[PDB]
């Protein structure tokens, strides 16, 4: 019998398959001036590693 | 009818982002007189309705 037992533990983080598949885009039209400068934002689809 | 000096889309992120931003032009009378109606004050036949191009 096993009278000493030790353990050990792993936060294995299981990210989604479909994760940076069509991510989140709510800049669809980016219309600007000749000129502009204006920054683009976007996030991927539930935001996990990749 | 809204007015302001930043040339940015009221539907943009730097703009309240709602709504659809229209261009507009001249400014906005109030419903009830037009302007010009005789010299001596008597008043001309005026325009209404909303959107109406007359």
Same mark, same amino acid.
């Given at each position: 019998?096993?009278?000493?037992?030790? =353990?050990?533990?792993? #936060?294995? =983080? %299981?990210? &989604?398959?479909?994760?940076? %598949?069509? &991510? =989140?885009?709510?800049? %669809?039209?980016? !219309?600007? !001036?000749?000129? =502009? !400068?204006?920054?683009? #934002?976007?996030? &991927?689809?539930?935001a996990?590693?990749? | 009818?809204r007015?302001? +000096?930043?040339y940015?889309?009221?539907?943009?992120?730097?703009?309240?982002? +709602?709504?659809?931003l229209?261009?507009?032009?001249? /400014?906005?009378?109030?419903?009830?007189?037009?302007?010009?109606?005789?010299?001596?004050?008597?008043?001309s036949?005026p325009? /209404?309705?909303?959107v109406?191009?007359?």
């Amino acid at each position: 019998v096993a009278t000493v037992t030790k =353990k050990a533990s792993a #936060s294995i =983080k %299981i990210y &989604p398959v479909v994760s940076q %598949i069509v &991510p =989140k885009e709510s800049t %669809i039209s980016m !219309n600007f !001036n000749q000129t =502009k !400068n204006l920054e683009v #934002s976007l996030l &991927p689809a539930d935001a996990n590693n990749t | 009818y809204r007015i302001g +000096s930043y040339y940015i889309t009221e539907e943009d992120i730097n703009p309240g982002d +709602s709504i659809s931003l229209g261009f507009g032009s001249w /400014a906005k009378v109030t419903g009830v007189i037009m302007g010009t109606g005789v010299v001596n004050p008597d008043g001309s036949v005026p325009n /209404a309705q909303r959107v109406e191009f007359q």
